[model samples]
Target: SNAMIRKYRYGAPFDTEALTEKIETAEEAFPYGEISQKEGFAFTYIMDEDDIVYGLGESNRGINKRGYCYISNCTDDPIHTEDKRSLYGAHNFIIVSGKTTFGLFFDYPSKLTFDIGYTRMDTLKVSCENADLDIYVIEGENAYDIVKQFRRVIGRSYIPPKFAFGFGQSRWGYTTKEDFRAVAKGYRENHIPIDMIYMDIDYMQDFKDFTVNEKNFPDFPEFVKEMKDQELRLIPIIDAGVKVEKGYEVYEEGVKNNYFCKREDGSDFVAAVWPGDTHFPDMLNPEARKWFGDKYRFLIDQGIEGFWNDMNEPAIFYSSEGLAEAKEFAGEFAKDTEGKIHPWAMQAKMKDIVNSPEDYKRFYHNVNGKKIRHDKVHNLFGYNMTRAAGEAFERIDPEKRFLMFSRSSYIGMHRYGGIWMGDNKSWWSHILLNLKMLPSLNMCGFMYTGADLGGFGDDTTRDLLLRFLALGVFTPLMRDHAAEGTREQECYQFENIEDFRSVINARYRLVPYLYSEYMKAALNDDMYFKPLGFVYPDDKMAIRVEDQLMLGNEIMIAPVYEQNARGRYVYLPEEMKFIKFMPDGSISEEVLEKGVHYVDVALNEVPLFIRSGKCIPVAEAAECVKDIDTENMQLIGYEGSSYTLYEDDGIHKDYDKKENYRVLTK
Candidate 1:
């Protein structure tokens, strides 16, 4: 039987009632096991060797996050290596599943550390930087049940427009209207299925949040109409920093209205981002958030339906004051010519000058007219910034759905929009990391989430792109974005364009099923994507499996994440029918028994398995979701089974009012 739930609270906690309601204490608040406190707080729990620790949202490592130390503070690190402790978003939910299953959620906003057996092989230690905290201990019959409970209390996760579920093409290089036209033409010309084309920082004027570059995006309204005419939604990027330029309307308004974050001296706190110098919006303030959020009207009036909020980890390249201090130190050191400075030392100092924790401590937020230090609520900058846009979208068009996602997030932000796993590299390891983070993010109420397809920072190879795209077929936010200087990675740019087309077509074919499952999961407070362990708790091997994931209740995905390898080792927890979807519109199936097998796959194939007793519905592929014809539905049946075909108008909130959707069971 479950014991009475215990709760703990420290200092003044931000009202994240957006995540959970305050519980009246029926039990005393105390640490579950060994506890220590210093500048903040630390808790230690002893773990059995077989126990698997899961859920540090958007973190590196496998499904069983047992060996790594993760930091909860949001940062702008793009390279997603195994050793990197943190990524963009911060979700502090951890489930200890083994002899006894339970989950813990630490509601501390600043830097919290999860040393999951990293410091010591047998202990799990969690520490937070802020003294203010709220800890919840959840008990359940199983990990899946516990996750469902967590999702229930965190409020409903945000769902994007149904078209967002389709394949999207993006790059940091798409600057001009012609450049976007070329991308749309490539996909259309090549017969590749795509629904959205993202506009990155290059689309903005001097990297401002709301302005479109007139020269590059001449006649922006006409371009928007053209893209919509082609059934391709144009999603623009929005940053947190308002460039501190006199002529810039956004900056001028923020300065005049006192909308930007301020320093202890009552001066606007300035930081350098993509623009030379910028002031961050005080998103925590209601009036300031309204001021900044309403600015999206500029694009909304132009018919834009989606926005990507980035650099709101409030990523600072450097503070103007920090740069001056660094320059002064460098100048002082240069006077001593006896010994030459190590190049590495200078680089480290400069990097520190950019995102220094000290710099974060100096800035302040207006919390209901009370000045709160930024570091005290550092993790919230991005979350609140995202909240601003999401709230504005509701007012801008209440009946329509808009696509919004942020690079940085907290538990409460999931209700507004989803997040893309931040700046990943073109490394094979990231493919697996992307898989591992999906279910964990789901545990934190992020149903619509994914990483950059084909990687964002590094040059992607054809094999890597194919393999990554295979996984993207199952992810909710299926967008392939790359850095500006990196090699062009559009599917049409690759030599094996047909392979990419085949994989994308497979995604288009499954949009009906994927989007239905997503809506069902969101409405039911369940996970659309789940780890193997969540569904097969009795299978010990399934609990440890990372590469293989259950796409829905019926199908499992085992993507080929390794380069130079034609196939991968797959673990089938139970008897299943393995299906191979090839680039040439061919399908092959074989019955595999419960065991581990090395399955051979080709360069142009993606492998999916159907649970023996389940059936999946598929539709005819098209260039985009709008063109998808479901008149002749293909029921890929593994056995005698039934399925629910969810249908809706696809672009409105009528479903919420029980007006425009129908659920048909077959």
Candidate 2:
């Protein structure tokens, strides 16, 4: 079979020239178009002249639209962006020169030297090879200048939303409606900025899809109304699995209509999951997707604003390999026509369908002998599920895009939902990884991404937790989350709550600057939030270093990465002014005289810097983010510096459809 032969290449070497020739021949046979392969690359000549290439892993793409490619690892879904592609797998790159566009594919750690010339006409030439797992663009005259040119074209980045700048408390609330209300009110009284309150699976009635527990909140409508009255937004969890209770309407409809995936013999395929024995809605089916879309109508009408579509990797019990199981099972159920089968299987089947020179006559026996392999289909299952969710959301609210968070996704998941890095252990590696990961994801096409702050597991020490909090404040989606049984690391839970109060206060002070950048991300394709290289493309030291990054164009944060290091080495672009966000909601400047400077840091100190000629905006701290007095924000000015702040309803579809944006200046 064609697929078997493809797999064989991984184990055995073959004639490189012959492989390319055969691949070219195969490309000629494609219906819509063909994809040709060479020794180190493969490509499809997109028929459309402006056939914008998107989703080439975590790299950001669409320079005129959003700029840069967003590629990330397999399990690197942060709350901000949804990236579910295979971490260490094949690489895909796109090239467009006026009307001639092509694609290049390679394996991870494999490198290729390429060049792009834009003088007479745009062109690309790649050379060199290595195995460090990197993706780059060829820009400028010489091919070697492409990477720099792409970064230049991307230019400086935008800022983030102000609410995103506020202190996001740890532990998604799951108590009774009254309990949650009390917490919200208490946060307001205590002067904390609780912008978004997250709801875990406990809000559902025994994990029933779209059904809230009536007993916990007797007046659900009133509860949402009260919260809406405040500035806060409510984000609830929505899992992909539908419980299979006989009387449950979702289950009943799925079973009766054969909406669930079928067994090889046509019987319904059932699996045990969070909802116990369950039936996954065949999201691959058009009709099934329609049904799921309609199901969200009532919830949307009920004032549910934000959604976190958890377990959509279609996670089920009986598997430690959550991502692997999802791809395997889902692949088996996908229809062959519109559904995806392994490329190898399709090739093998085609071979069987066509007789080899002899009088084989397209043997019917060979067709029947071919079977789909689970491993071959594993990587794409999550991407398929996300596609289904994206369609369903569009059906529910077609006017604007929806933001739904999920775990376990693959390449192209960003077109549907956002992702939060799954349960991370409470360790320093997580802190270091967060620094290293943003660039990787940024290059992947997932501009919006973040990790669980304070780590997701273990009992964190106050120092570690505080340092994590510092690191989070500078991240794209700043959130403080930990494991279920770990010590409550929320700002209010600390023994010296007042000591850490300044960190939360500092977040409030940064609302304006953060909001401005986020709005820029929406208006411009460029990520408002990014690593150091995003802003200082020419600064070689900043490009490769990852521990610190820019909050927007002007601000940079270098979090204390160690437990006992009193002074921290923070990288500063030439001639920048640095500041430490103090516990008293005040600022002190650190001047980067020349190159990288070493700043003395204390347990309570957070190293923050601003370009010499920039100003930042701030809003008064509120208990819950909802009570933020948007009308009375303050602007902290710096000589020759300026910033724009953005705000709007954090939930619902209005932000995108109506261009509902609030602006502030500093």
Candidate 3:
């Protein structure tokens, strides 16, 4: 068959077709007979023993995803263990390669179960909770061709400003103006490079969105200007819940317009989040989306240029109704209880009370003036929430590029903005998890996605922080963030601050090359970051390797993910030039023959290599992206090669009109 592609619509599928207008309707292909299931819909595909499956974005386990069940439920899961099926995204694009090649996109918004050989060794079973689905079966000459076809049908990914590629510093502990000032000052004083500083939940008034605390940030507008004067952009966090206070303008407006999600009886559905009991905006409604999105004008009128949308997994802490039900159950159980209460039972009850599927089912969304149950289309909540902000930015500041990223996302949301791999922990395994997810996220059109560097939930050790920074150098969204009450993880807070500075500076130096590669990949509908398998489909050994990644076509990054090991074994698929980067701006080079070798590196070293026939462009390190000038550029060529250097004003959409970039040869 000549690369046949077809779409099958079942039940009353929501307008997920809104994301793409490219695919042509074709006749159904019941190749393996009709698909039939009672609870939902399921289909099985035959798999060879050595067949490799790839592309469930933000999932657990290896690059070749098999032997596990993954659920597409956006959740507030911070603990990223192997057992956790869902994180914060619900991308259902799978590519099956090896013996037979094909791709599948399960465009089901609600819960989806991908039993990829978990139940049976030779069968791949896929099912969704609801009967409504938009399924696409794609065929291509190879794996990369299939991904390119999928991306073309899905539409081009969103592109952020060039400065977004620069290094960023963030922490939940920065509660005061002085704390913000100290972080900006530290980076300058230590000669470290940083472009953005994030203001977490503490920056808000009682953790409410669109309101800043006057006491903490007195003269807020001037403070924003001052940060901008220092070339440090301040990005505030926007939560999903609008605190249900009578006088709060956002809450009042939502209530007055019937903009909040409603229960079966038509009352506003209530859920507890950071700001106590709150209401979620019904972003499915166009008017509600506009109202909620325009609320960002309150901060945009100030000098704020970016925002981070969070908690739109609509993460529920505990519903008032659920709490009451739990309390009543506890009382009934207490009457029959003897001496002691089992802690495990109480813990399970508490966990069940928050983020319950029952709670999700109780709420309803007004889609086209019709009430639709929230659980029927739960994954769309965060996607629509972020869509509000993204759509607003077009009208708010049409010419300027605003930094937008979210904590929760679905498939088509990549066209609006990117997502941060939700609240990861401070474990060494998470570092490797971060590495493995990069290429997969790119496959799903999240070109600007990244994990919380140095971990977000727990205390990070000095060694772990340094190692994480090395990997951060290649990530498009480079930010090191930690949770509240955790040990301070700002680069300056650590003893070996130079190591952090060195890695960040390395990122700054490569910004020209990285930015160019990113734009090239995005414009061409290709992955900026790729697994070796995607690029070297013929190399069987390369397909199995996961620790190493191909960054921007030319560079291969091998980060030391182990705890105290000086170095790790690196597999070179082809002859490569090894460049050892040290903390003090020193570089060592060697030509390694294609094979596996245990490379020795120091605590302050970042192991980077170049393919034998490629070259990279670099510039002098600057403290901020805007300060970078390519006056004295250096081309480190392993062999003769050419590169494209993309440049613009770095803040506007002028590049979209005409290309203000240049191509260079060395």
Candidate 4:
């Protein structure tokens, strides 16, 4: 009676079903789509014009998915372009809306592909590649109702410390103690609001997980404390592979306990990540998951509270055996190409070495006493790896709350941690991708997810970074991050430092409303962000609009994403109050009729629309989440006077039940 959801099980599906409700397998009539077992079991849907396809969180393209084949495997590719099929995290749930609206989730742990209207313009072919799986079909009055149904089954989304909502400045270049000190010094010096300073792999001991390099920062624990005192949290990176160095405690323990993934011949599998040779902890194995998860204690005991798990697509650079095979092929081909060494073949040797499909087949996991092939459960690797840390948190410090997110994940990891969209380029197009992924991620029960604001790869220009930051202001995880060798993109680094401060201040000012909505969504199983269409499905203009989105029910965000454009076109489904939050912390509001209009927006401006009869709360900007005063509030909007504010001490495991709500009116 909660939702129109049906579950179907086929063959022997290995239990990747963590925390999800086990509805007894339904054998009733299959009605929504066509199923064929000519090869492996696959479900297909044929679409017409009004039927828009949506979902696939942490994925590429638009809010409405169409004409592309997306793979469900948690890939580690950084070139986030349209041609790429998959990125990190597999949220294989989609909603097809037209005259009839339906949501489908293919609960398979293996590599799967969704050919949505790609092969044929009207067809959606979901290929599971095997018969062992579960298919969940959700039907509702609208897309939102269907989302709530799916959310109910997948457990609660991960909520963060209130400080997690504040702006974070990070880069791959920040290596030494002075490097972070310089950034912390710069942000405060420029009056730019910042809460987090990230520690990349360079901070670790030879790129090993859980061990920081003392040489980089002489006193690791003291460094964290130093940053915290300045109202900044040092969020560090944790990779999937453990270094294979002799006498390394993590490696030795994995080998001793048979916790590392094994080859077909039963030897520990060897692969390369950042630390050259490595072994993956068999996260699918129960004991291995606990052992690997407890490793976080190394950092947790040091008072560190947050971490981002990386390379856990278990992104293998090259397996020891794989490199040898490549060598063999290159050596054999070299004997024949005596004068003409083929560039294509040589590049294939190096390119295919990383993210090899063969590598997935080379290893196995000891899942519930069964030696299952790695390829069969490849998608669950990151999900379970994050689960390791999430489960460990309770045992390590039951009363404390931590900020944990991963680069790779499946459905259930949302209850454990959040996800940051993998390495994206500093292109104008990615700002659009960032906005689109927000609503899609929420539908998949990942309410606390955001992309790398200003992009992680490619050198970002001053204008592009500022434009991206304006959009990041609305994201639950607001962090501006870039990779090594790219132009440093911290807000303070730009010449228009004051303008950057303005955009960040807007984020802090809205934290009161944003945090309140986020808690409500997590507690009640709803989405904080919405596709314009989800709320106005009947309005043709709103249903087709993708550039703009609704944040909670009161405000709609239409951040300027295009570069060098004074203003872009916006579509309003109803009469609304359009607000532009400027760089000087001033607010400008105007009423617009329901229609499509080109709204002129500035480089340092954040644009928003308030629906009829609604209002939102705002507060003074704070340098950190802890410093923000939610007790005193200001409700600003049009034609509405009431708002409910949710509050609690931001840190505690039992904070969800510890509630305080205030009703405010303007």
TM-score of each: 0.97, 0.68, 0.97, 0.97
lDDT of 3 by residue, 178-270 (tens): 899999989889988998999999899998889999799878999999898988989999999999987999999899989999999999999
Clashing pairs in 3: none
Q: Report lDDT (Cα) of residue 632, candidate 2.
A: 54
lDDT of 4 by residue, 1-666 (tens): 444778788888877764378777888866677888778888888788778888988887888898788988888898988998888879989999888789888889988898988899899899877889888889888888888889999998988888899888788878898899999989988878888888898999999888999788777889899989998999999999999999889999999999999999999999899999999999999899999999999998887889999999989989998899889878877787465768687887888888899999999999867899999999999999999999999899888779999999999999999999889999999999899899999999998888888889989999998889888888999999999899888877778588888888888999888998998888899899999888997888788788899988788889888778999888899988888888778888889988988898899888888888888888887777888877667677864468878877778746445356777787
Instruction: Kindly indicate the candidate among 3 and 4 with the higher lDDT.
Output: 4
Residue ranges of candidate 3 with Cα displaced over 4 Å = 1-4, 22-25, 32-34, 333-343, 656-659
lDDT measured at residue 11 in model 1 versus the true structure, 0 to 100: 72
Query: How much lDDT does candidate 2 score?
Result: 0.51
Give the Å error, residue 289, model 2. Answer: 2.6
Error of 2 at 137 (Å): 7.8
The local lDDT score (0 to 100) that residue 566 gets in candidate 3 is: 94
Where is model 2 more than 4 Å wrong at Cα? 1-167, 170-175, 178-182, 230-232, 319-377, 380-403, 624-638, 644-666
The 10-residue segment with the lowest total lDDT in model 2: 358-367
Which is the winner by lDDT between candidate 1 and candidate 4? Answer: 4
Which wins on TM-score, candidate 1 or candidate 4? 4
Give per-residue lDDT, candidate 3, residue 646.
68
Instruction: Report clashes for each candidate as comma-separated counts.
Output: 0, 73, 0, 0
lDDT of each: 0.85, 0.51, 0.85, 0.87
